Design a protein around this ligand. Structure first.
Ligand SMILES: *[C@@H]1O[C@H](CO)[C@@H](O[C@@H]2O[C@H](CO)[C@@H](O[C@@H]3O[C@H](CO)[C@@H](O)[C@H](O)[C@@H]3O)[C@H](O)[C@H]2NC(C)=O)[C@H](O)[C@H]1NC(C)=O
Ligand SMILES: *[C@@H]1O[C@H](CO)[C@@H](O[C@@H]2O[C@H](CO)[C@@H](O[C@@H]3O[C@H](CO)[C@@H](O)[C@H](O)[C@@H]3O)[C@H](O)[C@H]2NC(C)=O)[C@H](O)[C@H]1NC(C)=O
Ligand SMILES: *[C@@H]1O[C@H](CO)[C@@H](O[C@@H]2O[C@H](CO)[C@@H](O[C@@H]3O[C@H](CO)[C@@H](O)[C@H](O)[C@@H]3O)[C@H](O)[C@H]2NC(C)=O)[C@H](O)[C@H]1NC(C)=O
Ligand SMILES: CO[C@]1(C(=O)O)C[C@H](O)[C@@H](NC(C)=O)[C@H]([C@H](O)[C@H](O)CO)O1
Ligand SMILES: CO[C@]1(C(=O)O)C[C@H](O)[C@@H](NC(C)=O)[C@H]([C@H](O)[C@H](O)CO)O1
Ligand SMILES: CO[C@]1(C(=O)O)C[C@H](O)[C@@H](NC(C)=O)[C@H]([C@H](O)[C@H](O)CO)O1
Ligand SMILES: *[C@@H]1O[C@H](CO)[C@@H](O)[C@H](O)[C@H]1NC(C)=O
Ligand SMILES: *[C@@H]1O[C@H](CO)[C@@H](O)[C@H](O)[C@H]1NC(C)=O
Ligand SMILES: *[C@@H]1O[C@H](CO)[C@@H](O)[C@H](O)[C@H]1NC(C)=O
Ligand SMILES: *[C@@H]1O[C@H](CO)[C@@H](O)[C@H](O)[C@H]1NC(C)=O
Ligand SMILES: *[C@@H]1O[C@H](CO)[C@@H](O)[C@H](O)[C@H]1NC(C)=O
Ligand SMILES: *[C@@H]1O[C@H](CO)[C@@H](O)[C@H](O)[C@H]1NC(C)=O
Ligand SMILES: *[C@@H]1O[C@H](CO)[C@@H](O)[C@H](O)[C@H]1NC(C)=O
Ligand SMILES: *[C@@H]1O[C@H](CO)[C@@H](O)[C@H](O)[C@H]1NC(C)=O
Ligand SMILES: *[C@@H]1O[C@H](CO)[C@@H](O)[C@H](O)[C@H]1NC(C)=O
Ligand SMILES: *[C@@H]1O[C@H](CO)[C@@H](O)[C@H](O)[C@H]1NC(C)=O
Ligand SMILES: *[C@@H]1O[C@H](CO)[C@@H](O)[C@H](O)[C@H]1NC(C)=O
Ligand SMILES: *[C@@H]1O[C@H](CO)[C@@H](O)[C@H](O)[C@H]1NC(C)=O
Lengths: 328, 175, 328, 175, 328, 175
């Protein structure tokens, strides 16, 4: 080997691991605070406060709700034929036309909201024997009276309101959404003045369905000078089917159809400012970053978003246990 | 944790080791020195990143859903809308809470494991020439200069080269 | 160092762990019965059989359902202005007044049940031209006929029932719940005898909504001597809005409003006895202790309760594997 | 379990140890003895309690919810009310079943781990003076009276004090 | 002791584990592809394409939907008194009788579908003063006109339609399902021709409930030669209760009751072929094997089935890590 | 994995071992051979089967449920029917993904564990007569013919029978 290898010394080698002065507490199966070298937060808890206008198509409703934009309230005429990935409805929106109510408001708002378009096609309905284009001073369009742009109020001609019986075939290859309504007069006098018959009736049908609504006379609270109301209804007509509108008084007739589509559109109630930035996840509180897996900003979201969770903090340990060597 | 190296037989960490997660300090002929071990440092880091990336794998996207805030009182259907969402949130919250608890528990045992594996690996290499002082340090029973310490660290140490010197020093003595 | 240790012997040291004679079987990722030293049950599976009357305010409905307590069935007059955290409805409850039906019974029971109060404020409605306080022998109050305490049955005065058109503003800063109804006569003779007009009509509205119900004449099955029915309806009036009731016959008028609140109240169907004890978790089977995380007593609960689970036993090992030394 | 001490190299437990979960039995110049080890007993117990407390952490409370029992047949909406609840119960039942399975599996490996850590710790301390008989017992190759056994147990044993006596007894013999 | 005699040598013993040339990649908490010796698939992703007719009782609806089989469309007379564990409805099914609509079609289809029986008991209703058994050429039964087998169309006798007021007690100990309807005429002339009264009315009631429907005159789209419609309604009568049918025109009367039961029956829309084989899990795509825990064939299932999952593959490692000698 | 035997101190597997999962390869003065160890092979297999059977334990059955495909547009109630099912599917998909991840992670550490337990068991048995070459092989310092190798394998090896031959060969030499 060598010869008498006599140098009798020894050495010491010690293994160890790092430690940091700071360190983070994390939860465990057995401990709920144990300190580790480093951790990463998994719950997104803050919004920018602004809805980024990119990548989704944000349509700001300004002072229009989506249903008034649909019906064509004069002040929402800005939105005709408009489209959106997300329609934002603001708390300040107001209606300002003939007082109306929508029996299942909630479904019509949904159904339009996810169709994502207000594209309107006018169709040639021929109403023979009645006066068309009725308007009201509670729905001012410009200096004059007015009514919803997408609806057509029929009243008597001379001394008669005939039984209207019109039909419109769906010959295209897409579904057609028709919005129509019925006018509820305040007094029997109002009823006969406008529609002659002392009891109106509207029946709208397809091969598949039918709705017959009869009006209801009576005073409601004064809203924009009126005690009357109109109630809004809708009918989808499938390709190849046919719409038949049959009425004997009180019909608020459709002027054509909205076309329907299938997409990723939806509506959101939010007073957050829209701003220019790209962000995939939208919350009524503004956009948030979807880099973390969970979020605690809001349970309402649109887009690629973290899963909402009740916790506002969940730290994932990304390091070993911190066992400091003093702590400095 | 499960292996009892970290916060176990190794009393505490070294706030001074800034170049890696696991490593060696020695005291020898030429003095004292420290050095991080990069292979176990990388093994611990890769596993934790792998775990991390799996957790950040795809936020799924959702578009039109159900209403979750209501302004009027409606009864039966709105009670259901509220109950579907509230039971959805509690189930996802349970999931997030359990996931980070299992995850963290495992990250502490995994890093415990790598410390212990580096220890065992060094033990194995020194063969009959060192003894374990029981606190994560070996007493090397032969003259081992800085190049000898570097060969243990870079894993090329040949025990045979020092075996008789070591066995003499270690056993013989006077008993 | 030391001198001749003449004797040089050895010692034996053995490490081991305890074991118990008994031991419990638990499930595992790899085994479904493995025996451990000790375990703890995680599923609560038994009730006391009694609903503790503390800490929540239990209101025992005795033989009244909540809707009859609301309407004011004579025999439920005990509950006027009463309040509750949990209203218990008993299987024995019975109605004993004018036969009525409630179109969305389920929502009205919910809506009242979580409001948690039957506080009624009487309001000064003035019905001019009709006879007030109509009553019936199927709703005996004391020796005499009677009707629901909270409703007011209007019939003609002399030879006329006018068109009633009343209004009541919500000037307070809280929502007001109005319960009203319509009487469906059995015969056209009954209709004209009571309401003169051969076709009644009730329209109740606010700025936001309207309901018009028309009665339906015809015989129903004899219930407490009658074939007629009254159907119950409800209208919430928000602060600042206004109620307008307009009718031309058949109106069962409101006498004021119930006030609404927002709280933790609910209703429960149970024949369990109420008893004095404190218990946070209530089940239709009686209270249960929420010390365990899961329970198998009932999926219906109120209060701080364990999560219902299909399993009736889940043992958490609280000890090591039991490896005893004797045979079996 | 994972470490193979309990129900592994240690053949079976001691029904006679009533004062702790892990411990020592010895035989020496002065006789036989048993004694529980309280540090590992406390370590196992604290971990299991910690685990336990996390499981009993807050029953959340719920007030008005949806109806879950019905007396008439209604169709579409009642079918949904029933489906929301039935899928809620199966999801929570899955959770409870998986939670106690992971938990129990871990409790058996954790207690296996503490046994093994106590063994390793004792091994380390006896240094060159004992050998492992492979059944969880060490053969101590030097005279070790009751106070010597007590110092191994309370962790103050100095191996140097007996090293030459032990090394002689252990190796020399006749080969 | 043991005496070597002469030889002086050593031996080498090495421990190792197997490896395979092939090997499968699996996901892990820390890796998403790590290669193991062997794995087993947990997601069932393929159907046979055929609905096995065993063990559940599959009833193939052929060209009948369940509601037409219920009503008794001539062409579905094959299904009278039929029963099923799963009724399969085909995309080709067509109706071919008097044009009808069902207000809550969805609940009636459900309610019948899980009752699982079309057992019909005829009851002796006596309609005095009207012409029974009305039929129509849009519902041909054989060469002649016809109508639904389970419904009875009443029209006037001579010059009068009286007020019908009939009753039928539920004296049995089970619930009785009554299907009835109302005829909506196209013209007022049609109304008076058939029912004399210019406004019909149907009120069907029990001690517990009442429905009054009034018809709606107007033209709907031509369907099988007609613009009229009939709308279908249902009433369940509990043991001990009593049905009272009261009408003054337009009643499409019941001929008896369907009996109801409680079971594991349901309905499925599928064009998959029924075939002879035993399979517990049915999917609209055909049966699938429930040997795996999760499936990705369809979210719609009937029977003992794997849990539907978005993933189409999840491999469970059933072996150690594969560390081969050469490569993979 | 956690123990660092498989894909750790044992460099790689043997594609040639077809008779078991774990086993022995030897070289002595009478030849070389291979042999599977059936006890650890059975221990690994039983645990994985146990795990497997728990996963395939009862598909629950469901009969009438809610509609999940619709042909007309309805609004509020159909939006809820769709949301109840979509949140049900994502919750069950999360469960399946997390279950096989925990499961697989555990199957790799469990099989790592059995390898390491078989190594430790053999180490313990050879006592002072062999040394660990650090790569999963022991250097047996005494003449050990095929029957001696068989006794180590079937666990009847008596170290005493070879202790002085071994200790001589191992230590004495010339240092
Ligand atoms: C039925 O009863 C209601 C409630 O009493 C009557 O409504 C009230 O009718 C008056 C007269 O049209 C309304 O007056 C107008 O109010 C506005 C705002 O104050 C003001 O600018 C006008 O100069 C006028 O005062 C009053 O607002 C209205 N109130 C409500 C709550 O609707 C209704 O007129 C009655 N109808 C019949 C036919 O008897
Ligand atoms: C329409 O048809 C129904 C059913 O046939 C008639 O109902 C029945 O009317 C009679 C006479 O009012 C009721 O008689 C009562 O029986 C009870 C005992 O149950 C008795 O205490 C009363 O003094 C009286 O005799 C009978 O119960 C009732 N049955 C049902 C099921 O309602 C109804 O009268 C007919 N209406 C007209 C206007 O034709
Ligand atoms: C109310 O308006 C509708 C729509 O214009 C009218 O419906 C149409 O009525 C005609 C005459 O009955 C139907 O014609 C028949 O069609 C079949 C199939 O082509 C054919 O065999 C007959 O010889 C005849 O042509 C037409 O199909 C029908 N169209 C629709 C969409 O229903 C209805 O007649 C009007 N009613 C009144 C009272 O004015
Ligand atoms: C109150 O006067 C007005 C109005 O609203 O301004 C005038 C308006 O020209 C008239 N329009 C038509 C088509 O009749 C309208 C209706 O009579 C009333 O709204 C019925 O409710 O009344
Ligand atoms: C049958 O006799 C009674 C009754 O119920 O006891 C007498 C009662 O004074 C009368 N009350 C009024 C306000 O008219 C009531 C109605 O006429 C009947 O309920 C209409 O349905 O009828
Ligand atoms: C068009 O002619 C028919 C028809 O359907 O074939 C003749 C048929 O005998 C007649 N049946 C009865 C009971 O009246 C029916 C109705 O008048 C019509 O359907 C009312 O809608 O009309
Ligand atoms: C802590 O962990 C996160 C995620 O692994 C990482 O980005 C960060 O740099 C880590 N911190 C340090 C000081 O290493
Ligand atoms: C809306 O779009 C349709 C389809 O191109 C078009 O015919 C119509 O005139 C448009 N109207 C407005 C107001 O943009
Ligand atoms: C988000 O918005 C809701 C409702 O507007 C509010 O209660 C919540 O605290 C907000 N959270 C954040 C992070 O902005
Ligand atoms: C290990 O260290 C010794 C001393 O520095 C050196 O000669 C040898 O080349 C090193 N080997 C490697 C692979 O770094
Ligand atoms: C069993 O475990 C439970 C919970 O840890 C504890 O209360 C009980 O005392 C234990 N039993 C024994 C005998 O230690
Ligand atoms: C109910 O409470 C209101 C409000 O204090 C009170 O005016 C009314 O008279 C009370 N009536 C009864 C019967 O308690
Ligand atoms: C609780 O009540 C339900 C319904 O009353 C019953 O089926 C169940 O078995 C009861 N369970 C217990 C533990 O009392
Ligand atoms: C350990 O045991 C020895 C013998 O009993 C005793 O002298 C010593 O003080 C003990 N040390 C401790 C810390 O108990
Ligand atoms: C792979 O695993 C499955 C389930 O354990 C088993 O049936 C199959 O035989 C295994 N493959 C091999 C080659 O052992
Ligand atoms: C249907 O079954 C009932 C009950 O046995 C029987 O009376 C009736 O005549 C049956 N009708 C047909 C068409 O099978
Ligand atoms: C099952 O059927 C659905 C709808 O018919 C289809 O989209 C899906 O891809 C099919 N899957 C299989 C495995 O057949
Ligand atoms: C172990 O191997 C030796 C040599 O083959 C043999 O004599 C002995 O009986 C074996 N023991 C067992 C239990 O197989």
């Amino acid at each position: 080997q060598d010869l008498p290898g006599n140098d009798n010394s020894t050495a010491t080698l010690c293994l160890g691991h790092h430690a940091v002065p700071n360190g983070t507490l994390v939860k465990t199966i057995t401990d709920d605070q144990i300190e580790v070298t480093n951790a990463t937060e998994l719950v997104q808890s803050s919004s920018t406060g602004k809805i980024c206008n990119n990548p989704h198509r944000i349509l700001d409703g300004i002072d229009c709700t989506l249903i008034d934009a649909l019906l064509g309230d004069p002040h929402c005429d800005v939105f005709q034929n408009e489209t959106w990935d997300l329609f934002v409805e603001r708390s300040k929106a107001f209606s300002n036309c003939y007082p109306y109510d929508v029996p299942d408001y909630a479904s019509l708002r949904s159904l339009v909201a996810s169709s994502g378009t207000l594209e309107f096609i006018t169709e040639g309905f021929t109403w023979t024997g009645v006066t068309q284009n009725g308007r009201s001073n509670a729905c001012k369009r410009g200096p004059g009276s007015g009514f919803f742009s997408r609806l057509n109020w029929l009243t008597k001609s001379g001394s008669t309101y005939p039984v209207l019986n019109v039909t419109m075939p769906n010959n295209d290859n897409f579904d057609k959404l028709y919005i129509w309504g019925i006018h509820h007069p305040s007094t029997n006098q109002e009823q006969t003045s406008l529609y002659v018959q002392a009891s109106g009736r509207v029946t709208v049908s397809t091969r598949r369905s039918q709705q017959t609504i009869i009006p209801n006379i009576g005073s409601r609270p004064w809203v924009r000078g009126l005690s009357s109301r109109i109630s809004i209804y809708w009918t989808i007509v499938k390709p190849g089917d046919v719409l038949v509108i049959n009425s004997n008084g009180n019909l608020i007739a459709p002027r054509g159809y909205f076309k329907m589509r299938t997409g990723k559109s939806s509506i959101m109630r939010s007073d957050a400012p829209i701003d220019t930035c790209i962000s995939e996840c939208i919350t009524p509180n503004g956009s948030i970053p979807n880099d973390k897996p969970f979020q605690n900003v809001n349970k309402i979201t649109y887009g690629a978003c973290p899963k909402y969770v009740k916790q506002n903090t969940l730290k994932l340990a990304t390091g070993m246990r911190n066992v400091p060597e003093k702590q400095t | 944790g499960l292996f009892g190296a970290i916060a176990g037989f190794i009393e505490n960490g070294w706030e001074g080791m800034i170049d890696g997660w696991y490593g060696f300090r020695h005291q020898n002929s030429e003095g004292t020195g420290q050095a991080a071990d990069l292979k176990s440092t990388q093994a611990a880091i890769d596993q934790i990143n792998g775990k991390l990336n799996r957790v950040i794998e795809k936020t799924n996207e959702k578009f039109h859903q159900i209403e979750k805030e209501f302004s009027e009182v409606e009864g039966r259907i709105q009670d259901l809308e509220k109950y579907v969402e509230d039971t959805k949130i509690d189930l996802w919250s349970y999931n997030a809470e359990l996931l980070v608890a299992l995850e963290n528990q495992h990250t502490i045992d995994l890093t415990d494991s790598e410390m212990n594996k580096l220890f065992e690996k060094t033990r194995r290499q020194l063969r009959e020439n060192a003894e374990e002082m029981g606190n994560g340090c070996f007493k090397i029973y032969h003259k081992c200069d800085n190049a000898c310490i570097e060969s243990i660290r870079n894993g090329t140490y040949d025990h045979d080269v020092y075996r008789d010197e070591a066995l003499n020093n270690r056993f013989q003595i006077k008993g």
